[PDB]
Amino acid sequence: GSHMFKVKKLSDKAIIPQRGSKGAAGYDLSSAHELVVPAHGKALAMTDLQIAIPDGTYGRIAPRSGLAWKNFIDCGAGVIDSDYRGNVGVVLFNHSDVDFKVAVGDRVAQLIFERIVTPEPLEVDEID
Amino acid sequence: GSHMFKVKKLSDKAIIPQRGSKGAAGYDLSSAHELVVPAHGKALAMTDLQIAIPDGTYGRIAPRSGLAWKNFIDCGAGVIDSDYRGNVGVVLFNHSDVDFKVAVGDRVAQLIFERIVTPEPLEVDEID
Amino acid sequence: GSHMFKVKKLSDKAIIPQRGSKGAAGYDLSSAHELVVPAHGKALAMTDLQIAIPDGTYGRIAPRSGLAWKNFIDCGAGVIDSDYRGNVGVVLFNHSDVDFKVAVGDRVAQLIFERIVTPEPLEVDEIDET
Ligand SMILES: O=c1ccn([C@H]2C[C@H](O)[C@@H](COP(=O)(O)NP(=O)(O)OP(=O)(O)O)O2)c(=O)[nH]1
Ligand SMILES: O=c1ccn([C@H]2C[C@H](O)[C@@H](COP(=O)(O)NP(=O)(O)OP(=O)(O)O)O2)c(=O)[nH]1
Ligand SMILES: O=c1ccn([C@H]2C[C@H](O)[C@@H](COP(=O)(O)NP(=O)(O)OP(=O)(O)O)O2)c(=O)[nH]1
Ligand SMILES: [Mg+2]
Ligand SMILES: [Mg+2]
Ligand SMILES: [Mg+2]
Ligand SMILES: [Mg+2]
Ligand SMILES: [Mg+2]
């Protein structure tokens, strides 16, 4: 369906992503797992979700602004293809000298459905 | 708003964002404040702008390619929701060994109106 | 104008970007040059490609997921404008404690044609409440 996207929980801990405000760009993504993101290190926060990417778009794992500014947290990777398989994972980057604790249920990113196009590349001799 | 990019200066130091060329993806964002982005550190550069953005889009704070390559500067966070009516700020990351000076009026990022969709989430037991 | 993605090789070492799969978002970008991204450092991996992109888009240099989790590699900069006619360069960031080797032909990023809009900015006194 065009105006809804299906989401299936892979555990009881999974939270259905939802928009924070009427005008929100993204859907909050929460970790389904307790973990720590090491200082100057990286970690995988699995959401325990399968998500069906809308036609004409990819799912972008985008950073929460609070965590970025206060905790020096960022999202690496972040491209969820329309044919991505399985559990959707958030790759967290911590550039601070302080570990970042992640509890089950913590919002760790936001999912944005980026509209894109996918043409077939045409190799040429000259561009004008 | 509807299909517009509206810009309201919050101080006389604010500069209206403009595309560097007709083929540009992004609008130049300038700091309205002097600051330093510490080596291996982060800073918040406010634009002293309040904005309304076109429907079907969020504003993405993207990095300038020059600052990225010469100075190891990046943008953290960067997602400006269509219903944000606060002061638009650029979260700067400095991964280099050297402090990065930012003067009032310096271009520190570029704003891109990313087209997106926002379907409502539909929870299911199975996709496909 | 042009809904097409056109690609001109700038050397014999260049590889035409292609999607890894039918449902893939991005086009694999391969380095056309031997280099190393220094531990805790950055490097330019030129693709030796000149490109023309579809109208209403820019080209985003987006990170590969394997390199990100496995090697702590990220893409810096990454905005390829409609009028960029130079050699497309991948700015690679290495946040690991170990160097990252790049051989010619290595996929180092993926190109995504982001749909965007570019309206004329309007300075106003008043923005509507939210
Ligand atoms: O780089 C940024 C990112 C966000 N913002 C602004 C706009 C955006 O709409 C707003 C987000 O406000 P929130 O307090 O709701 N942060 P978020 O919902 O992303 O969660 P968190 O507070 O943990 O980041 O902050 C910036 O000015 N610059
Ligand atoms: O990762 C990138 C980013 C940009 N580019 C290209 C495309 C883009 O159109 C061009 C921008 O070159 P400049 O250094 O002149 N841009 P500047 O740093 O002056 O500002 P901005 O990056 O905001 O356009 O460089 C790449 O090849 N790879
Ligand atoms: O976002 C991520 C990134 C990595 N991972 C883990 C599991 C996954 O199997 C692996 C990344 O595999 P990819 O298929 O995404 N490799 P990549 O896209 O980088 O390269 P390519 O598709 O060309 O082989 O790392 C995640 O779960 N989520
Ligand atoms: Mg990034
Ligand atoms: Mg970016
Ligand atoms: Mg990948
Ligand atoms: Mg990018
Ligand atoms: Mg650019």
Author numbering:
A (entry chain A), B (entry chain C): 1 to 128
C (entry chain B): 1 to 130
Please quote the paper that reports this structure.
Also catalytically-active was a core version comprised of polypeptide subunits that retain M1–M5 but lack residues 1-37 of the N-terminus. A homotrimeric structure of the core dUTPase enzyme was confirmed by crystallographic analyses that additionally showed interactions of the shorter N-termini with the C-termini likely enhanced substrate access of the dUTP substrate to the active sites. In most homotrimeric dUTPases, the C-termini, containing M5 which aids in coordinating the ligand at the active site, are flexible. In the core structure, PISA interaction analyses revealed that the shorter N-termini interacted with the C-termini of adjacent subunits, constraining their engagement with their respective active sites. The limited movement of the C-termini contributed to the different inhibitor coordinates in each active site of the core dUTPase (insets). Notable is the position of Inhibitor B. Interactions (hydrogen bonds and salt bridges) by three glutamates of the C-terminus of Chain C with residues of the N-terminus of Chain A (E120::H3+F5, E123::K5 and E126::K9) produced the most displaced orientation compared to Inhibitors A and C (detailed in Additional file 3: Fig. S3). The C-termini, which act normally as lids for the substrate binding pockets, instead were restricted in their movement, which may have allowed increased access of dUTP to the three active sites compared to the full-length protein with its extended N-termini.
